[PDB]
Ligand binder design. Structure first.
Ligand SMILES: COc1ccc(NC(=O)N2CCN(C(=O)c3ccco3)CC2)cc1
Length: 119
């Protein structure tokens, strides 16, 4: 029932994501010279280094907020892809499955801790 435990759990999961080869394109911002139409399609850029910095700054209140930003990484890749068969999109999809498999217990434990706190 540790209301703060999500934060280190999210740090460790980001560490796992950074070790995954599938995270390569999503570790830093899209260079808008190699992909100059990017901001015509994507309103809100997001990458894993921005997620990790936000977490480390103390600017997430909850793991739900971190989860929203990580899902934005994936939705941006789906919106920008020219094909459902693209190399970066297909990595986006496997990384998403990995992230959702690992974040489910972090969210569940947080929300249970906050329910216990307010019991
Ligand atoms: C400095 O080194 C960097 C920094 C960032 C990157 N990332 C990068 O260019 N991206 C291309 C667009 N994108 C897609 O989701 C996507 C779907 C289909 C095609 O692209 C996100 C990833 C690469 C090298």
């Amino acid at each position: 029932y540790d209301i703060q435990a999500w934060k280190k759990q999210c740090e460790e999961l980001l560490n796992l994501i950074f070790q995954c080869e599938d995270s390569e394109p999503f570790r830093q911002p899209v260079d808008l010279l190699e992909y100059p139409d990017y901001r015509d399609i994507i309103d809100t850029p997001m990458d894993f280094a921005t997620v990790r910095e936000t977490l480390e700054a103390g600017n997430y209140e909850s793991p739900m907020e971190l989860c929203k930003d990580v899902r934005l990484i994936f939705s941006n890749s789906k919106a920008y892809t020219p094909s459902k068969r693209s190399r970066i999109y297909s990595m986006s999809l496997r990384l998403s499955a990995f992230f959702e498999e690992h974040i489910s217990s972090v969210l569940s434990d947080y929300k249970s801790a906050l329910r216990f706190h307010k019991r």
